[PDB]
Amino acid sequence: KLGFFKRQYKDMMSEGGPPGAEPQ
């Protein structure tokens, strides 16, 4: 998993759900 969740977590950390609205 090392590397799969790290990249998927950092990608959603900037979008936070919306199209790049809230960094979550």
From Swiss-Prot:
Cytoplasmic side: 1-24
Function recorded in the entry: Integrin ITGAM/ITGB2 is implicated in various adhesive interactions of monocytes, macrophages and granulocytes as well as in mediating the uptake of complement-coated particles and pathogens. It is identical with CR-3, the receptor for the iC3b fragment of the third complement component. It probably recognizes the R-G-D peptide in C3b. Integrin ITGAM/ITGB2 is also a receptor for fibrinogen, factor X and ICAM1. It recognizes P1 and P2 peptides of fibrinogen gamma chain. Regulates neutrophil migration.
Family classification: Belongs to the integrin alpha chain family.
Superkingdom of origin: Eukaryota
Residue ranges annotated as motif GFFKR motif: 3-7
Places the protein is found: Cell membrane; Membrane raft
Subunit structure: Heterodimer of an alpha and a beta subunit. ITGAM associates with ITGB2. Found in a complex with CD177 and ITGB2/CD18. Interacts with JAM3. Interacts with THBD. Interacts with complement factor H/CFH; this interaction mediates adhesion of neutrophils to pathogens leading to pathogen clearance. Interacts with TMEM268; this interaction inhibits ITGAM degradation via the endosome-lysosome pathway.
First and last residues shown, out of full length: 1129 to 1152 of 1152
Name this protein carries in UniProt: Integrin alpha-M
Tissue expression profile of the protein: Predominantly expressed in monocytes and granulocytes. Expressed in neutrophils (at protein level).
Record's comment describing the protein's domains: The integrin I-domain (insert) is a VWFA domain. Integrins with I-domains do not undergo protease cleavage.
Source organism: Homo sapiens (Human)
Organism placement in taxonomy: Eukaryota, Metazoa, Chordata, Craniata, Vertebrata
Disease annotated for this entry: Systemic lupus erythematosus 6: A chronic, relapsing, inflammatory, and often febrile multisystemic disorder of connective tissue, characterized principally by involvement of the skin, joints, kidneys and serosal membranes. It is of unknown etiology, but is thought to represent a failure of the regulatory mechanisms of the autoimmune system. The disease is marked by a wide range of system dysfunctions, an elevated erythrocyte sedimentation rate, and the formation of LE cells in the blood or bone marrow.
